[model samples]
Target chain A: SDIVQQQNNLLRAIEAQQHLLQLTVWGIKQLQARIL
Target chain B: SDIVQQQNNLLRAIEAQQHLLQLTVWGIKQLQARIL
Candidate 1:
């Protein structure tokens, strides 16, 4: 419980950003396929 | 055997990058735990 509470705001945001970027990458790959 | 030999590196490079990032995240999380 404490560990989760201890997670800083920036770190959480950074984690979310990291995951979203990964999703964005796959999105681009699919788009790239369609356009080709 | 009618197998075609594979000759490429970007797949390996991509996997290496994936491993490095996941490792990096786990490493950071462990380090965070240590400080608490």
Candidate 2:
């Protein structure tokens, strides 16, 4: 059961990281627009 | 052995995510500098 819990936690962390990446990407795009 | 491998994989993934976060944070700081 602990292994299962770890697997779930890993999934959640990966998801959170992906969401962070998406936010950064959007911010970068906005910054790009400002430059041009 | 497989469980150990999974544990190691999870650790590596978390480390990679942290590095990604650091890079993104630096980029955001640079962007902030450009804005002000």
**What DockQ results do all the predictions give, each relative to the true complex?**
0.02, 0.71
- Model 1 DockQ class: incorrect
Off by over 4 Å in 1: A1-7, B1-36
lDDT of 2 by residue, B1-36 (tens): 799797888879798877979798798879879796
| Residue A13 CA displacement from its true place in model 2, Å | 0.3
- State the weakest 10-residue window (summed lDDT) of model 1 chain B: B1-10
| Residue range A1-36, candidate 1, lDDT tens digits | 433343454355457657955865665565557556
Candidate 1 lDDT score at position B24: 58
Candidate 2 lands at a TM-score of 0.81
Clash list (residue pairs), candidate 1 = none
